[PDB]
Symmetry: C2
Subunit: 106 residues, 2 copies
């Protein structure tokens, strides 16, 4: 069976501030393995106009192992948002982040 790679958000920190993400993030959330992969900044500027190129960005993905339709992902997705949200909230202020909740559509 193919695993659904559910995007959850991003984590970032100053490149000058070398962090050990393995000491900050859990290996799984809501029963699904959590992955973090470094990627280029997905946006050029922060809210205050500061350039993002001084930060290293990590893409957060949840590997969901299922066979059910896209619709069934709801329960797990909601559980992940709450759980991951609780984890990132307790992180030091130097670590920036954004979850799906911060991707307000209209």
């Amino acid at each position: 069976m193919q695993a659904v790679r559910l995007f959850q958000g991003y984590l970032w920190h100053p490149r000058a501030l070398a962090l050990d993400l393995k000491a900050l993030l859990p290996g799984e959330v809501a029963g699904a393995r959590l992955l973090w992969d470094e990627v280029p900044p997905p946006t050029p500027f922060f809210e205050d106009g500061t350039p993002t190129h001084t930060q290293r960005f990590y893409q957060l993905t949840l590997l969901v192992l299922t066979e059910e339709p896209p619709e069934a992902l709801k329960p797990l997705a909601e559980e992940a948002a709450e759980a991951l949200g609780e984890v990132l909230e307790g992180l030091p202020p130097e670590v920036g982040w954004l979850l799906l909740e911060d991707l307000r559509p209209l």
Copy 2:
């Protein structure tokens, strides 16, 4: 050679309006494969209070085949994301979307 998955953002449309995304979207963008997966909404309500359940959401990802590390991939990453932006600007307003390149996170 590395196969890098770069999340781009979300696309959505009324559930009642059965669109054929395979016909709507291009298979590739800037030499990178464009992937889309139906997933739960990133949030339960639109910026206007209406529930997001009335739509079907899809996460958009660019699959880039590269030998460059994250920091050096920036140029190509930006070019590719910008190209996708132009693709979506050409879609009917019924197709809603949000791309990271336009986001200004805190």
